[PDB]
Design a protein around this nucleic acid. Structure first.
Ligand SMILES: [Mg+2]
Length: 113
RNA sequence: GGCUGUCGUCAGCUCGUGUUGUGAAAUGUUGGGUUAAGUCCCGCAACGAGCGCAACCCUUAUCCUUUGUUGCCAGCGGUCC
């Protein structure tokens, strides 16, 4: 029917009660999201995301999780956007005004070697 | 006032921004290694920075350059030696 063979679920008994209205089933202790009803969500964050993206807005991807770090840098910066696949950093957005220094440093430094 | 002793030549002491907490405060600055060292790296709701330790000052250990007088005396002779 749908491309579900590319996955099956994850987790087990740690989960979090916050998720319940969407449970495809339960096996091997690992819970399985009810993609059968997740269909709307599978596009929801895309539709209302289109107007934003199509509006040509700065893209902010985050893949600090080593389990897919570099495996996303491409689909991000290399994809004409931004990212942070490596290791996230505190204050990057909040203490932004401060991080600028460090950021502006990796630039004016490239001219080194 | 200015000056100085004192721990202490100790590696400490802080601050701005962000964030957590009602608040007093905390974080950083804690931690894993490492160093003479807040030394360096790694990690981290922290990001950075200021005073301080590490440098430049002196001086000694070498080698060269030049300058050779009052300093020097090797090859040359002289020589009251
Ligand atoms: Mg230091």
């Amino acid at each position: 029917m749908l491309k579900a063979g590319v996955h099956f679920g994850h987790q087990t008994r740690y989960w979090n009660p916050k998720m319940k209205p969407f449970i495809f089933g339960a096996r091997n202790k690992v819970h399985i999201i009810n993609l059968e009803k997740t269909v709307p969500m599978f596009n929801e964050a895309l539709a209302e995301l289109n107007k934003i993206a199509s509006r040509k807005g700065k893209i902010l991807f985050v893949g600090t999780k080593r389990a897919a770090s570099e495996a996303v840098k491409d689909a991000a910066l290399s994809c004409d956007q931004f990212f942070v696949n490596h290791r996230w950093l505190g204050g990057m957005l909040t203490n932004w005004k401060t991080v600028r220094q460090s950021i502006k440093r990796l630039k004016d430094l490239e001219t080194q070697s």
